[PDB]
Amino acid sequence: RVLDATQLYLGEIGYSPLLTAEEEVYFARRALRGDVASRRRMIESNLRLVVKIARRYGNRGLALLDLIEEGNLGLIRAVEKFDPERGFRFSTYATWWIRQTIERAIMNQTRTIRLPIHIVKELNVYLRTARELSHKLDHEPSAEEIAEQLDKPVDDVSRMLRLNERITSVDTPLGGDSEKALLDILADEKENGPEDTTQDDDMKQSIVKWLFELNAKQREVLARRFGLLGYEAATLEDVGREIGLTRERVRQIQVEGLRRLREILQTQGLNIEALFL
Amino acid sequence: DIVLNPLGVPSRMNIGQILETHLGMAAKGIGDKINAMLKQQQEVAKLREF
């Protein structure tokens, strides 16, 4: 017995009939015509080819059994759209599918933030150019050296090379054995600390008292425009919907509320003190 | 210049610091004699002898 998933699947596909020339045509003839037995024993037989193609495309994106799975899906589409009428072989035709299905599925799953087909194939043109430039410019090629070789924008070469930058994992230690990782250092900036939390409570509870302080028509008109006491942040012209119904008198009364409040901030001890903030 | 604790020596058993101090004293003692003879401006043959 062997309890490894890989050497077990490899044992199963081993005891499978390696098809000859008109054996492929004989089964594929009834496969396109639609046969239970043909599709299985064509696919079952040609699993041995998938493994070899998947073996060469390794240490790149997925592990290995993952390349075989996506490789087997390409072999199934090779069988659905094979043409036995043509004198050409199946191993020729299916090699195009298994290299294709694996290339195309690696491009998607290999990265954490999902990178599309266009941006990746864009990138491969820049990468193969870089290797040709590197052998004659000894040092690695710059983004301008690559951009200037293809006569394409410097921002476009920079954009795509920036997406190539891989993601560092949080659980990875800087220390070594068991000191600290990146979660132990990186701050939650979305949750503000008690100092910043209580300042907006004190700023906004200070303002609730300064509303009751100014005149009755001035703190009504000023508050409901900014949406401080009211429900929606309206404009000078939209304060007319309430009771004001004015354009000029609203603008004079809004500014009159702010002018009396500017002197309330110069006396309490802010104005230029709270201008820096 | 510095006042050290003598009780930081016997427990530690690092007596080289005390031999360093004694010899360091002797070393400065020669320096302070030569410094005095250069201030007094005695003689090149005298500095040679000492």
Binding site: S158, R162 | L4
Partner: protein, 49 residues
């Protein structure tokens, strides 16, 4: 480092447990004063915006 006149004797427990009592004159001479050159970088990056 630097060599200096050292007297081995206790002193009002200011040399309690290997605690050291140094003269103002050593600090005045700036002889144990150390230079610390410090490197801080300012980077203009490219954000989404």
């Amino acid at each position: 480092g630097q060599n200096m006149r050292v007297a081995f004797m206790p002193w009002n427990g200011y040399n309690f447990e290997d605690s050291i009592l140094v003269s103002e004159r050593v600090v005045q001479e700036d002889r144990f004063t150390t230079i610390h050159i410090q490197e801080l970088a300012c980077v203009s990056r490219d954000t989404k915006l």
